[PDB]
Amino acid sequence: KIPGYTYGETENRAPFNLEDLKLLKEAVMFTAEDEEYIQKAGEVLEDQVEEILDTWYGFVGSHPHLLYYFTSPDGTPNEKYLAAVRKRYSRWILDTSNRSYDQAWLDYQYEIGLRHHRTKKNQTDNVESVPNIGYRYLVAFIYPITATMKPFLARKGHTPEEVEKMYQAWFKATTLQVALWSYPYVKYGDF
Amino acid sequence: KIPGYTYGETENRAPFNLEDLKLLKEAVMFTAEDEEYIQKAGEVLEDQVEEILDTWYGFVGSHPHLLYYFTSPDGTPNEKYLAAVRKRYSRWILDTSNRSYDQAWLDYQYEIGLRHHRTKKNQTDNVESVPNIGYRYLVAFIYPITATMKPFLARKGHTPEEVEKMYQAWFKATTLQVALWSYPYVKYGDF
Numbered sequence: 001k002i003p004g005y006t007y008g009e010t011e012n013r014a015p016f017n018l019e020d021l022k023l024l025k026e027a028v029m030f031t032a033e034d035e036e037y038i039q040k041a042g043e044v045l046e047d048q049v050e051e052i053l054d055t056w057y058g059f060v061g062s063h064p065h066l067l068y069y070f071t072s073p074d075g076t077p078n079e080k081y082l083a084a085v086r087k088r089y090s091r092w093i094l095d096t097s098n099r100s101y102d103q104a105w106l107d108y109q110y111e112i113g114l115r116h117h118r119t120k121k122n123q124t125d126n127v128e129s130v131p132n133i134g135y136r137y138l139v140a141f142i143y144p145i146t147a148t149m150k151p152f153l154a155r156k157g158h159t160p161e162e163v164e165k166m167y168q169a170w171f172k173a174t175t176l177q178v179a180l181w182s183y184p185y186v187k188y189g190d191f
Numbered sequence: 192k193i194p195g196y197t198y199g200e201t202e203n204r205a206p207f208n209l210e211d212l213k214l215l216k217e218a219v220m221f222t223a224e225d226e227e228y229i230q231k232a233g234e235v236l237e238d239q240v241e242e243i244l245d246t247w248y249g250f251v252g253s254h255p256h257l258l259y260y261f262t263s264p265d266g267t268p269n270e271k272y273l274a275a276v277r278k279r280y281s282r283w284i285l286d287t288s289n290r291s292y293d294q295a296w297l298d299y300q301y302e303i304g305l306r307h308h309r310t311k312k313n314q315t316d317n318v319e320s321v322p323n324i325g326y327r328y329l330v331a332f333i334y335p336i337t338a339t340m341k342p343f344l345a346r347k348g349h350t351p352e353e354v355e356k357m358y359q360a361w362f363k364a365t366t367l368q369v370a371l372w373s374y375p376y377v378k379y380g381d382f
């Protein structure tokens with residue numbers, strides 16, 4: 001249903017395993033409590049995805065140096081690229097909320113990292129665009145991901161403490177993912 | 192003074208400049224509005240630093256794979272190392288809140304990244320310890336840094352809205368810094 005989306009059918013095994021993941025979850029203070037609240041976050045976000053996507057890509061589109069990563073050689077946004085990625089980002093919202101964080105999840109996290117990185121960027125959609133997303137901005141984007149989700153998490157009449165727990169779970173899960181996605185960017189042996 | 196603390200006295204110019212910083216601030220949604228609240232955060236945190244340090248190093252100390260980065264080759268924690276770093280971390284709380292984010296600030300950011308990385312780790316305190324802090328944990332630590340600061344930000348009686356603004360400012364500034372500290376870890380040209 002979703003072009004380019006290959007969760008559970010990636011070509012590579014991730015260079016990290018469930019033991020690595022356990023230790024990283026501990027570093028981001030992610031526990032069974034957050035598994036519960038990330039699932040609840042999904043329930044709240046699921047029917048708000050179109051507005052989330054508009055808010056997220058609105059932010060990206062608001063800064064030329066960010067929109068840059070979706071541009072054709074002529075400096076204009078590649079609309080085919082944007083539209084195809086948007087469908088996979090929509091799915092990532094659900095995957096973050098609903099998937100077991102097992103080896104298949106890890107294998108896809110590695111894949112997503114490879115796709116932001118020069119290793120695989122522009123291959124999934126067969127587009128001509130910029131070769132690499134500078135790592136500085138991947139880390140940076142942990143923040144706007146959280147700031148984007150925050151208002152939507154409060155829109156279904158949950159208690160502010162329930163919202164805070166969903167927001168913190170999202171923050172933890174996003175940090176965890178970007179940590180994993182960093183692998184292809186990091187000098188070998190330094191990850 | 193503070194042994195090893197060389198803010199404004201670094202040997203190298205950072206590989207990033209104020210134009211890089213402007214673009215990265217935009218990526219973390221940091222504006223003039225956050226400058227106000229990061230300064231306020233400093234006013235709130237300053238006389239609570241001992242408790243903050245105890246909480247932070249309490250978290251690190253409670254996980255063998257994190258405390259690991261302060262250990263001597265025989266696996267035992269190096270208490271001299273811990274104590275010396277603690278003094279510099281205490282200063283970093285104030286610098287984040289009080290310094291102009293100019294080229295001197297950027298130069299020290301580069302230096303802090305080099306000190307977590309194998310490039311300079313263990314040199315400042317002339318200790319023998321683990322050669323490198325795996326980058327996965329630098330990213331991960333954005334979360335617990337923010338989680339550690341949050342309760343302290345509310346202890347001076349500011350409104351929930353002001354506390355939230357201080358917290359969000361701290362989150363942005365932490366993410367911004369970790370993005371810069373990634374430089375020595377990232378494959379050359381991919382940052």
Ligand code: HEM
Nearest residue numbers: 066069085088089092112115121122124137138141142145
């Ligand atoms: C917290 C940080 C980020 C998150 C959570 C995120 C999320 C995602 C997701 C879910 C996908 C689709 C993955 C798939 O193929 O299944 C994707 C791809 C993509 N993202 Fe991001 N992203 C982040 C950082 C960034 C940044 C900084 C940029 C720069 C504008 C960016 C631009 C893109 C582009 C251009 C693609 C397509 C890559 C390709 O050619 O395959 N992303 N992102």
Ligand code: HEM
Nearest residue numbers: 257260276279280283303306312313315328329332333336
């Ligand atoms: C958001 C992430 C982090 C922040 C804000 C932070 C903060 C700091 C600060 C302010 C310093 C002193 C810098 C100076 O010399 O002036 C430092 C050094 C140090 N930190 Fe971190 N840190 C982070 C990640 C980590 C992680 C994941 C570890 C692993 C336990 C760690 C362990 C250490 C060690 C061992 C040093 C001494 C390095 C050296 O030999 O010079 N830090 N950190």
Ligand SMILES: [C-]#N
Nearest residue numbers: 056060085089
């Ligand atoms: C990424 N969007």
Ligand SMILES: [C-]#N
Nearest residue numbers: 247251276280
């Ligand atoms: C780092 N402490």
